[PDB]
Design a protein around this ligand. Structure first.
Ligand SMILES: [Zn+2]
Lengths: 264, 144, 108, 292, 166
RNA sequence: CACCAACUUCCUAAACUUAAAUUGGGUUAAUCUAUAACUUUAUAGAUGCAACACUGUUAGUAUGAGUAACAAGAAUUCCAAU
């Protein structure tokens, strides 16, 4: 029949070629990620000093789960685990062209396979030089804090002791429900694991385990300007002004291998 | 992790027991796709029990209960288990068959034990490397 | 439950001719090289599969006659041999099934 | 003007068709037996030099027409639209055959011929563009190559990214046009006259005439454009699904004329490729391809 | 009962002159008595309208409804007679010009109920009408572009005629 | 410092005055007879002579509706098989 036929990427791939295709895909992912490792060495846009009223960009992270965390006071606090995976800046929108009040930056993480995605999405990412990301989210960022697209974002952008706002889609329960975007406000960060980009956040976060979430600085009036004492645009490992510890702890948090806490 | 089958939990196992016994006897059974998928895991684990050893007392209790016909019990430990010693898994091959034309249009599948003496099933074949697209991919592979 | 008035054919015609209620076309139809008949991309050919089952029934019939009794499943491996093929030393210690037909071309 | 050459080229192509039609008197019945794997042994009584393999495909089913790109007449590759000549054994070739190497060559040659058509009409009539030949390169090379000699005025001009895209637009339009590949076997004397102005085409006609005992040469026509062919070509231009003009490499010996070898890649509808795979293939098709 | 669909297949056109184009073949085939609802058969008929002979056969082969199997048999019969009697040279060169279903004579029975009630039992029968035209199916419709729509509106404004004036 | 608006009124052609039981008068569809007519008509004489409506009667076909609704233990080597 002179009619359309349904095809998949593996339909016409032979076993020998199929194995090669997998190797080629891995090579492309490695090369693209390495090229984007150094943002400051890739003609970075000018970075401006902090002033009151500036807003930093947010990140997208994966919810590993929850585990118990102890403080130096001996109390046990359940903490949720958030992992930042392949977080990169993708598209910058000018202040006028997006919203007269403030500009926005698009950030996507959690790289995904290219086999089962539309060519349009791949075309945009090919220009960006990065592999496709699972989720695209828009973050309001002031002009001074704008960062060139393709800059890798890491969990070190946030720091222990900082309250943060996490919004994620709630678990769907079917006809009975759920599956609605919700935000939890005022969650403190207990610890950050730089090597695996894991942020330890007080309290529970909406959604199932392994569910992508959007993380942005706390918008509560009390924490209006916390970025003054934090990396103002973001944390750049490329700059390497001072290498951060692999695991970042809050002062109250009792690190493992510390002496047993005695209530004296 | 389990399909809701049978008038009760016992019926599912008894029905699975009936299905398992038939497959061992014949080594190739045609049944509804859902049943074949559900029982595929049991068949693979049963082969592991055969691999565990004939002397294993626990295997006999499992084999005795699951296999109503006791002539199969020697077969499992002396035919199925020796056959699959080299294999580390994938003992059962399950393929989708066109739905039954019995006015209910049930989804059909065929489950067989690999290494059997029965004629080979008409398995699907991937495209040959001689194809133009594969030949082009071969050139790219050679250059890299 | 009946509407307070008869439903007009015009109203009814629109309901049944809405695209949601019409039969959809399928584009996943494929050809089977083995049988030369049609197949679905995710469904195996039945014309060739029918041959396998028919041969299986014939093979099973021969086994049943050879066993000669119920609950006589051997504890030893089984093998099938066709006319023109004779039991070999490798076939020793395995139940041997003899088929009057010659070795089928598809069967190896 | 190039348009005048196409007009006279088209006419001689048409007159040759009439002469061949007049050459055959009446309709002669030839018994062609289907040796194809599927439905083997069917015998069609067909009109000699009139019936084509496509007609036989029409007789059987539409599936045959869609999936058949070539025909094996007595074990010889025959174009789907080439009139049958005698009682023979006919088999249909598809892109998914176990050994499509014969099909690959026909697709390879047809793609090169399509590229040649784009070049001649891409440039303005003011400039002089002469097609030299279509080099034969393996499919493994990753790109099909067409050689063309430009005028001195274009010696300093190299296609830009937009210019390359323009070439693809012409090629894409040709595929969209879906022009069937007309096939004619013509003697050298007529063929030389048809391409008398292009001296490079003249020698290629002589080479083909030299190889065979007669002077008959294989001429293929896409619309107005006509070209010589080393072998059988694709029935229609619509077969190609993806088309790209990867790059152009200028041959170093450009003193008499600047000989450019253009690199392109194309894929049939039967063999679609993923976006990333196509991108890598296009990148791999931008490298100079030598003939070995 | 009326059987004029068959009579449409018995129509014989006058001999065409040498300077007259070859008339496209038209085949009228129908199954008068089918133990099936016409409405259900109509749904199958509606989808297959305008499709090619090969495409319709392929779609029917993988259809789950009983009516679809009946249509395939009817379609296969129509194709056979078309080549046998209507001089269809190529089997593939056929398309479904028309496909529709009609009501058939039914049977009347009373449906008893276990608790003293009763119902009206009816045995439904239907007719199936198809006309097949030799040749490929006609090309599908192309939606109007913005330019086409805009031009018509301007033409309509120009086409306006003044009302009840000298 | 006007205009609009009713068949009120005027104007051309015409017309000659505004609820409902009841009461006077002139026609007519259809069928048949007498006697004619002869693409379907006339003069007389007749009648089972005209129905959107009698808890009216018979037949056809819709709507609710393709809705309510309904159904056979497993495998195989096979429905008087295991
Ligand atoms: Zn097959």
């Amino acid at each position: 029949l002179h009619s359309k036929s349904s095809t998949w990427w593996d339909e016409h791939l032979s076993e020998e070629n199929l194995s090669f295709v997998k190797q080629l895909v891995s090579d492309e992912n490695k090369t693209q990620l390495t090229s984007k490792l150094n943002p400051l060495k890739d003609e970075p846009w000018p970075l401006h000093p902090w002033e009151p009223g500036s807003f930093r960009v947010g990140l997208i992270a994966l919810k590993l789960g929850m585990m118990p965390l102890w403080t130096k006071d001996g109390q046990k606090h359940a903490v949720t685990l958030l992992q930042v995976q392949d977080c990169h800046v993708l598209k910058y929108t000018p202040k006028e062209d997006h919203n007269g009040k403030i500009a926005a930056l698009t950030v996507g993480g959690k790289t995904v396979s290219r086999f089962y995605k539309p060519d349009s999405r791949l075309e945009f990412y090919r220009d960006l030089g990065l592999p496709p990301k699972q989720i695209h989210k828009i973050f309001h960022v002031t002009d001074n804090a704008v960062i060139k697209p393709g800059t890798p974002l890491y969990a070190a952008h946030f720091r222990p002791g900082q309250y943060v706002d996490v919004t994620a889609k709630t678990i769907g329960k079917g006809f009975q429900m759920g599956n609605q975007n919700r935000t939890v406000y005022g969650l403190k960060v207990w610890r950050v694991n730089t090597k695996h980009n894991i942020i330890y956040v007080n309290g529970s976060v909406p959604g199932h385990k392994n569910c992508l979430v959007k993380i942005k600085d706390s918008t509560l009036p009390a924490y209006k300007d916390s970025c003054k004492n934090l990396p103002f645009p973001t944390y750049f490992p490329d700059g390497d002004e001072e290498e951060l510890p692999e695991d970042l702890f809050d002062e109250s948090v009792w690190q493992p291998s510390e002496p047993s806490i005695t209530f004296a | 992790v389990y399909r809701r089958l049978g008038l009760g939990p016992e019926s599912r196992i008894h029905l699975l027991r009936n299905l398992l016994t038939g497959l061992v006897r014949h080594e190739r059974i045609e049944a509804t796709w859902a049943r074949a998928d559900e029982m595929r895991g049991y068949a693979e684990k049963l082969i592991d029990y055969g691999k565990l050893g004939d002397t294993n007392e626990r295997a006999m209790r499992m084999a005795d209960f699951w296999l109503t016909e006791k002539d199969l019990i020697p077969k499992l430990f002396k035919v199925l288990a020796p056959r699959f010693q080299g294999q580390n898994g994938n003992y059962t091959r399950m393929l989708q068959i066109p739905n039954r034309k019995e006015q209910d249009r049930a989804k059909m599948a065929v489950i067989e034990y690999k290494g059997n003496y029965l004629p080979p099933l008409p398995l699907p074949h991937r495209d040959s490397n001689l194809t133009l697209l594969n030949q082009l991919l071969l050139g790219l592979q050679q250059d890299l | 439950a009946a509407p307070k008035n008869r439903r007009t054919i015009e109203v009814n015609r629109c309901r049944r001719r809405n695209p949601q209620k019409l039969i959809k076309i399928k584009n996943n139809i494929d050809i089977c090289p083995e049988c030369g008949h049609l197949k679905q991309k995710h469904v195996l050919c039945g014309y060739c599969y029918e041959k396998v089952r028919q041969e299986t029934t014939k093979i099973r019939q021969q086994i049943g006659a050879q066993e000669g009794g119920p609950f006589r499943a051997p504890s030893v491996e089984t093998m099938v041999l066709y006319t023109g093929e004779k039991p070999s030393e490798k076939d020793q210690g395995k139940r041997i099934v003899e088929r009057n037909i010659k070795r089928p071309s598809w069967f190896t | 003007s190039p348009t005048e050459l196409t007009e006279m080229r088209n006419d001689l192509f048409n007159r040759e068709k009439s002469r061949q039609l007049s050459l055959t008197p009446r309709t002669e019945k030839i018994e062609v037996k289907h040796v194809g794997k599927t439905d083997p042994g069917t015998v069609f009584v067909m009109n000699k030099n009139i019936s084509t393999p496509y007609s036989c495909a029409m007789h059987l089913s539409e599936w045959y027409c869609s999936k058949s790109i070539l025909a094996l007449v007595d074990g010889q590759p025959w174009d789907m639209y080439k009139p049958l000549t005698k009682s023979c054994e006919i088999k249909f070739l598809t892109f998914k055959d176990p050994d499509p190497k014969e099909v690959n060559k026909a697709y390879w040659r047809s793609c090169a011929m399509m590229l040649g058509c784009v070049i001649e009409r891409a440039f303005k009539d003011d400039y002089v563009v002469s097609l030299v030949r279509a080099p034969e390169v393996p499919v493994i090379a990753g790109a099909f190559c067409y050689d063309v000699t430009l005028d001195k005025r274009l010696d300093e001009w190299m296609p830009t990214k937009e210019n390359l895209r323009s070439f693809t637009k012409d090629a894409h339009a040709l595929i969209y046009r879906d022009l069937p590949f007309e096939t004619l076997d013509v003697d050298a004397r007529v063929a030389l006259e048809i391409f008398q102005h292009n001296k490079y085409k003249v020698d290629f006609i002589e080479e083909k005439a030299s190889q065979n005992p007669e002077r008959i040469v294989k001429l293929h026509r896409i619309g107005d454009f006509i070209d010589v062919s080393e072998g059988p070509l694709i029935p229609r231009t619509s077969v190609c699904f993806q088309y790209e003009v990867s790059a152009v490499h200028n041959l170093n010996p450009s003193q008499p004329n600047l000989i450019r070898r253009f690199q392109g890649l194309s894929l049939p509808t039967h063999l679609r490729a993923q976006f990333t795979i196509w991108d890598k293939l296009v990148e791999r098709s931008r490298k100079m391809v030598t003939e070995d | 009962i009326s059987r004029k669909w068959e009579k449409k297949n018995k129509i014989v056109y006058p001999p065409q002159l040498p300077g007259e184009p070859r008339r496209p073949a038209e085949i009228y085939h129908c199954r008068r008595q089918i133990k099936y609802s016409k409405d259900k058969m109509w749904y199958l008929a509606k989808m297959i309208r305008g499709m090619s002979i090969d495409q319709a056969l392929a779609q029917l082969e993988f259809n789950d409804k009983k009516g679809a199997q009946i249509i395939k048999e009817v379609l296969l019969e129509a194709q056979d007679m078309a080549v046998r009697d209507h001089n269809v040279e190529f089997r593939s060169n056929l398309h479904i010009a028309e496909s529709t279903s009609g009501r058939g004579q039914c049977l009347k029975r009373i449906r008893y109920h276990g608790r003293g009630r009763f119902g009206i039992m009816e045995k439904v029968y239907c007719h199936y009408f198809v006309k097949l035209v030799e040749g490929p199916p006609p090309p599908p419709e192309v939606p109007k572009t913005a330019v086409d729509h805009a031009k018509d509106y301007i033409q309509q404004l120009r086409s306006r005629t003044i009302i009840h004036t000298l």
